[PDB]
Amino acid sequence: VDPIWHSIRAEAEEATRNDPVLGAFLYATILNQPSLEEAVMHRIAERLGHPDVSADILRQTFDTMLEANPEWSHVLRVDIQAVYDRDPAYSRFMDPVLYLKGFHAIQTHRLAHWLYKQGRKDFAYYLQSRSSSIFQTDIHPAARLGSGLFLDHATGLVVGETAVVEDNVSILHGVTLGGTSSGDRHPKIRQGVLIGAGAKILGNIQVGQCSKIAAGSVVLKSVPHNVTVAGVPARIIGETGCT
Amino acid sequence: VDPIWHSIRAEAEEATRNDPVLGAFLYATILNQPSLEEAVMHRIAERLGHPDVSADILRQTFDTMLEANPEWSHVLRVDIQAVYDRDPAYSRFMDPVLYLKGFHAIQTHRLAHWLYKQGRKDFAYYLQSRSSSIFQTDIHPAARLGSGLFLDHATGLVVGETAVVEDNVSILHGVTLGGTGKSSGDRHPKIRQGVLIGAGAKILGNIQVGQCSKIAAGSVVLKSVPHNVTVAGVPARIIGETGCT
Amino acid sequence: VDPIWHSIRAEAEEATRNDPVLGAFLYATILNQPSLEEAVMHRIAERLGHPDVSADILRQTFDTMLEANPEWSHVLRVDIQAVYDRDPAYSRFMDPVLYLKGFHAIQTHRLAHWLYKQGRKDFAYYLQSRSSSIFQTDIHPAARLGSGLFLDHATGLVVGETAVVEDNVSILHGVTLGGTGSSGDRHPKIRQGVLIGAGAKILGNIQVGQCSKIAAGSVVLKSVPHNVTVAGVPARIIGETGCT
Amino acid sequence: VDPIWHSIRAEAEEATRNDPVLGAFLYATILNQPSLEEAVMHRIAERLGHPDVSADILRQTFDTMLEANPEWSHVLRVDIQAVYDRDPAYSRFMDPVLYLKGFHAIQTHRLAHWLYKQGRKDFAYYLQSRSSSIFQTDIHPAARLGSGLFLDHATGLVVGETAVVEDNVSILHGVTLGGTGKSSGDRHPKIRQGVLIGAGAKILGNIQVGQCSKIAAGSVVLKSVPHNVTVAGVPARIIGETGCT
Amino acid sequence: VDPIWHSIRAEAEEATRNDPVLGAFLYATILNQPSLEEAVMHRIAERLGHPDVSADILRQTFDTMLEANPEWSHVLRVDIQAVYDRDPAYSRFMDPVLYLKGFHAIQTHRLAHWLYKQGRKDFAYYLQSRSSSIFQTDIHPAARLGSGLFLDHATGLVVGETAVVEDNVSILHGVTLGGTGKSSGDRHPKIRQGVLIGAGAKILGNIQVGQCSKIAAGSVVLKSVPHNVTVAGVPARIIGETGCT
Amino acid sequence: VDPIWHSIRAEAEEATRNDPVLGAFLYATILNQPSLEEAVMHRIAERLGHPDVSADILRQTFDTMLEANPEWSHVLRVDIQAVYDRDPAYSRFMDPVLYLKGFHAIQTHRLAHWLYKQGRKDFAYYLQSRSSSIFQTDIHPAARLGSGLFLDHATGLVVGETAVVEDNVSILHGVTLGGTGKSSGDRHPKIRQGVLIGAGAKILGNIQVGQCSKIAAGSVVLKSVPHNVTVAGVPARIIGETGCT
């Protein structure tokens, strides 16, 4: 049972038929692959590949991560499901896999996070640098991100060293989870939270579960659960629930 | 008669004499080209090319768009003329064609939009994905952008699926024409002709910005803006009257 | 003696020991290089290198800039020292040289700026274009940037043609030093020691006085006195501060 | 009508259907191309392309050669027909166009040869160098090669600066059309119409190989060869009579 | 129990410690690989990879042939064993896997041969074209090559469509197993077990070279050669007796 | 003074004005370079560069060789002078530096030879493997080559582990300095000074070719040759007197 994988294979076959100049891209990336994991690792490694460190090295490293962490198989599928559930602009499971840099960046972080805890700090920093340049997402490898994360549009995401994001969170573009203290100094974003475009959340503060942070908000103090905050500085302007 | 082409040709010629190391780039992109259209498609294809999908296939596919849409020839030139007229930092028609990712992003979108309407949705998504990563401009292929569009600096632009931008619009970096977050069906802004949108501005929801209006940098616009006004702030308020360029 | 360069070589040697698969990257960019300058020029050239204009051409041109501006040797070391002193997420001098695109964007501008003063505007604009696309930093070649500059995270930086930034300034991502809405000199002057918060927009022919701090998300449309903190849309003075 | 072209397009269509992963290669090289000329020029540019001199610059230059030498359209097709008639290992018109380096090298020579005449000697020598490295054919740009030329397998062919090859010749791999002692002047072979040159044959000096004759494999030819003979051995000696076909 | 595999890993580890700049190459090609088969496929795919057809697609296609053809695992190791035993210039099992183009060209043909039989003739001919350009070995995908084949130096190898090379054969560079002889049908040589073919030798026509025989460098062979002889000369003459060993 | 270098710079300058599209190539390879050494190292590294092992790593390793072997500065110049003096087909000192794979193969070998002597055997074999594939010259890094070596056309050169080539030797394409089949230690030829070796010639065994002698094209040399003679044939016989220069 892997309904997502078989959906993705069917989409890739139709796409190839529908546009056969894309067949090298679709066969290499989806159709020739033995699994969804290897198709995701392959695509991300090809986007991050560079003369400095080949796609192959990245792909091979990704594989060793997947072997030290077989639960990523589940997390990964939950992440794809998040996009499929939450983004109306895209209708296929194949879309975050092939196209969506936010999805690419999340799994890249998962790689660099694992590497970083292994003492492989340069590899992790390399991935961090490459993701920042190619996906425009600067996430410190020490950062903790939950499963079912939705990073929509993504451009300009900054996430600090001691930041934590829990499960089922949605983050848009232009968001900072940063400082400025110099110990634990970055936000903790509890489960189900939505963070709107351009929001700045600064300091070791907490954003309560199910809360919403309106676009352009500057959040300088903890936000309770089930509320909506907005503005510079952010004040409560509404109530909400984990919908 | 094509004064934009011939002036770009003479700009490239001087640039090569001035800096001979750039001769391969200037000849391949401009001087060896038979037309402005071909030069523009070449430059863009080269910026977007990747081992996943070669610049050649992008270039070839661009040309199929120009065949099916000859009016792109005119749209291309008014988009160049917009940069020439509105940006004081550059003085040559060649500058947007060679260097400015905003201009490249616009034409990329026009290709993707055409492809999307033809049912070639993976090709359109691929271009949108590549434009987002390379030009930092995330424009859904279903979005509708008019001619005379000036995308200045560009970085961080997001334009939603149901957005419409009319003619002679100018948009700065860090601009979102997006949704509130509910949110389905027509849920993205309508930007009427002559509008200027300042840096970092967020315009959210199926709301309209009336013709010839100006949105100051950093504004968060949640309700419709009438024509002929300037709005600023979080949330936006009308601060002044204003007119078209 | 060049303790910064000698620490980097040591950091890179241990790095390859620790992770040998990165040996090609680390030997090519650091250990094989005769100097810190050539390691920095080489990394930047590899990042910006493209079929259109090769890394080799970029690297060669960088060396000519170095040859013509000996003082860059000193400026480069103060910029590195700044990341080391001011950023708690990184512990090695090698970090900005290898990974930090803000650092790479600054030295890229110093090259484009020099080129642009030589009349080599196309080479200048090509660098500007590439840096805007690869490092997400759009700095006009005519802008002036002082030494000890720290560009943290960098993504979305926009710096206009007439902008001036003095020594020892720190600038976060999403910053605009731009204009609104004119003709000539229309861009800000950021005096020494200033800190500019994430997302902050500083527009027009205005100045931010020495040691001042602009908070995250501030929109600054009037000149800011020395030794203050400003915040808000639009910004107002919310405090007093000094240099460090 | 251009029957060769139309056959090639149909063959490329079937090929893509039979093995879709080859679709990018087959579309970019054949199906997206507007003419046979452009398909051939494109494939060759891609094979020769390098970071030193991009495929694009090679492809643009080639197109410049075609404009100044409209005769090439014909030469190209008779070269292709030569392969289709003389090689039993291949059944399709597109085989030479996509795959056969001997064919690629002849058309590279034609480009180099024209450049050379134009005083563009670096570009000529660059192609010669790249062809020698990638197709293993070293042909001096000053060499003259006729049409209906068949370079079968090709590896290790060397053709001297003053060599001439007439129409309808077939040359195998390992063939030297080379020099003898030193000497500076006219010093390489003139090969007349219809000659077949066997594998590994060495033909040295300003000597002539007459109309319709056959050099067997491994022959060392140091003296002129009459028309309508077959020669063989070291030193090459006549062994039979032969004619054209 | 894969003593070849285990020695190769150990050679790669030592080589990386000895020359750390080669670490990316040796990790990616050896030490990050799960098997000898995947390392050999990877190396070959990287050497033949091109923007026309990526290394990735080659590697994926290779892995498919391994799947459908489990026999190759054995043929591969008797090939590698052939090199270790027969070449005095190289001391490691890692050497053919990484460096030796003759070894690469052999395994490449085995892929192309399989594809050709599946009806994927274009992919077979692309591999043939690419091998001929990069390894200088032109082997028709319909040629039948036995196990334990040693191709030493390789440059200039040409093997016709109807050729058959039996097991335990050694072939030097510059060798042709070719035709006369565009007669169509069965028209290329049949080389029997244990044969040694010297540099430069040309074997032409549907003829046979019998077991354990030795063809001296430069020989031109136009008629069947019996078992257990050494032939030499242009034309080739039996000059002696020889045993297998 | 360094007249070779100055002449190359002037040639380069002239070439770029003659053909501006080649400016990126000619600046990056010659005009932007501070020495002849660095120009030659750069060209070779760019031809040999691959995703497996970047041109930068090769170029940096070549620098290391130069740092330890300042003597190569002279060896390099006399190698360039050999081409200028001996090849009537090219009139500029720049020609071998840019174009001639035989000259590139020589300096590649000198690097590989030095690495091999340092115990960096894998880097040495990789260079040997790459040169074989890209220049078609298979030279074992343990071979000793003197200065003033002219490798004309080069395709198919094979030089064995224990071969020695003394100064001012000229070797054509298709040449083997190899072994016979009774191999142990020294099993490859010794070519003394001033020898000319003709195209396709095979010199097999631990035999010696004496001073100023000439080996005619196609020859198979199986026993030692005294000084001041020409040999020819299969196998080769002394056919006259000669004397070199």
Ligand SMILES: [Mg+2]
């Ligand atoms: Mg390509």
Ligand SMILES: [Mg+2]
């Ligand atoms: Mg092409």
Ligand SMILES: [Mg+2]
């Ligand atoms: Mg190059």
Ligand SMILES: [Mg+2]
């Ligand atoms: Mg590759």
Ligand SMILES: [Mg+2]
């Ligand atoms: Mg030559």
